[PDB]
Q: What sequence folds into this?
């Protein structure tokens, strides 16, 4: 089990936009892309803690609309010095991103239910 | 009572953005502005119906974030030719905009509850 201390997850940007098919005719249709990246904040050598920001950025393309933005969370990994965030494995990355991914799922469910007047879309990320 | 036939309300854009105080230091803080405008679609002379689009555009500034976008609804005013939408009075304009305003209130309540982890903000528009 990762020994994580987590700060409050933070929405920097959450955008719902209807697709503009006139614009896409000229410029091409947007593509879905979802990415998790990491910013180092601090290595505490004495206590062996790495503080970083987990950053979830997304553009998710539906038939009629696009969901896009960035959600992030400061995480402290207790008991490990992670020099380069690329050394974290897939399971570690998912664990680190889990609160952000949940935020994305819950905003998307509520916004799509309300905006479309249909049962909410569950991304299940 | 207005004799309205309404089509489904439509979200063109609904954006939540954290304020960028570095950007605002250079560029000035955003200001709240909410506006209702009208696009004529058709005057049906025989049936005496004016079809228009009611367009609610908004930028709403909170301490830490901004809500902005556009929500619209095609309305048909049955029994009246409205040559120039500026001839509608305040009560008529509110009635025409009511579904859009409700959409704005409900998206804002849910998005703020989820994103901020606090009771939803009720705009009460």
A:
């Amino acid at each position: 089990a990762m020994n994580l201390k987590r700060e409050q997850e933070f929405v920097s940007q959450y955008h719902f936009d209807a697709r503009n098919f006139e614009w896409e005719n000229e410029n091409g249709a947007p593509e879905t892309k979802v990415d998790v990246n990491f910013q180092l904040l601090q290595h505490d050598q004495e206590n062996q803690v790495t503080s970083l920001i987990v950053i979830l950025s997304f553009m998710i393309v539906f038939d009629k609309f696009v969901i896009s933005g960035t959600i992030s969370q400061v995480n402290h990994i207790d008991g490990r010095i992670v020099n380069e965030p690329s050394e974290l494995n897939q399971e570690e990355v998912e664990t680190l991103a889990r609160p952000c991914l949940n935020m994305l799922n819950r905003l998307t469910y509520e916004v799509t239910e309300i905006a479309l007047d249909l049962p909410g879309i569950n991304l299940e990320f």
